[PDB]
Design a protein around this ligand. Structure first.
Ligand SMILES: Cc1cc2nc3c(=O)[nH]c(=O)nc-3n(C[C@H](O)[C@H](O)[C@H](O)COP(=O)(O)O)c2cc1C
Ligand SMILES: Cc1cc2nc3c(=O)[nH]c(=O)nc-3n(C[C@H](O)[C@H](O)[C@H](O)COP(=O)(O)O)c2cc1C
Lengths: 147, 147
């Protein structure tokens, strides 16, 4: 089982969430390839992967803005090979704002219109993800559980 | 049965969608109160209504921006009386862009965190809603059908 985890993180919260998900996946036998969105090119990005998990934090004045390193990948998701792909999404956010982890719905919606098979509701973390450890760990165990 | 329909529309597409939904609801016996979001104040807005339907088009450079007359209502949705409220959302958009009818997910997500009961997946219209008439009519009939 091969997993690709791509994260867009600016203050490291979503990356720490991505490290946590990866440890639980590797702990379970999965060969997990974890890449920072600022380093990938969408072209054929998911090829060869049994499971893709994408994480992205959210920002914006009013509007819902995706983490800047993630925007490029999101703009070209139709080129990543998502058609029929097992996927699920997660991301950190903050309920003080208006659009709680809005980047997650946006990615989910587009993956869905792209034929990807979303295997679990996205994980949305409020505040320090370090205080959400069992939620992350639990969310990865249930996603391995949905495949 | 009393229905409130609030729409945020800039070029009139979502308002025409809102007129269509209203005709099918009134055609069915519902007493339908249709209000342009630029005219409401969120404070107690849904009081006394058996069904609330909110429509909003989407815009934004990159980001996902809600129709400006709708932003105020969306920023104060926790004050509208959504807790346990039968609701569903619709809106026009355009697939040429990146976030297809992204305002709809955003409103749905917040209504859900606010305890509203979403009675049907939101209706998302691509292009001229006038060419989507049976989809709108059909979507309102199934939402009356979900209550
Ligand atoms: C200007 C600004 C706008 C923000 N907007 C949102 C938002 O709309 N929704 C949300 O859930 N969090 C929002 N946040 C909170 C961040 O997403 C939060 O700090 C998150 O932990 C960042 O993850 P990062 O370390 O992974 O990239 C915003 C923060 C700032 C400074
Ligand atoms: C600058 C700009 C950004 C837009 N962004 C989006 C978008 O992100 N998603 C979408 O589905 N449609 C987008 N649209 C298309 C409009 O939402 C579309 O014209 C819709 O019919 C407008 O409804 P209106 O008459 O109800 O308010 C955008 C249009 C412009 C001019």
């Amino acid at each position: 089982a091969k997993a690709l985890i791509v994260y867009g993180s600016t203050t490291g919260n979503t990356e720490y969430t991505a490290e946590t998900i990866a440890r639980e996946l590797a702990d379970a036998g999965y060969e997990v390839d974890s890449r920072d969105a600022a380093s990938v090119e969408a072209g054929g990005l998911f090829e060869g992967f049994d499971l893709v998990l994408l994480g992205c934090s959210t920002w914006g004045d009013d509007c819902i803005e995706l983490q800047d390193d993630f925007i490029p990948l999101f703009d070209s998701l139709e080129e990543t090979g998502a058609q029929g792909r097992k996927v699920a999404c997660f991301g950190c956010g903050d309920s003080s704002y208006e659009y709680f982890c809005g980047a997650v719905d946006a990615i989910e919606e587009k993956l869905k219109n792209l034929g990807a098979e979303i295997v679990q509701d996205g994980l949305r973390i409020d505040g320090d993800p370090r205080a959400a450890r069992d939620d992350i760990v639990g969310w990865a165990h249930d996603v391995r559980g949905a495949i």
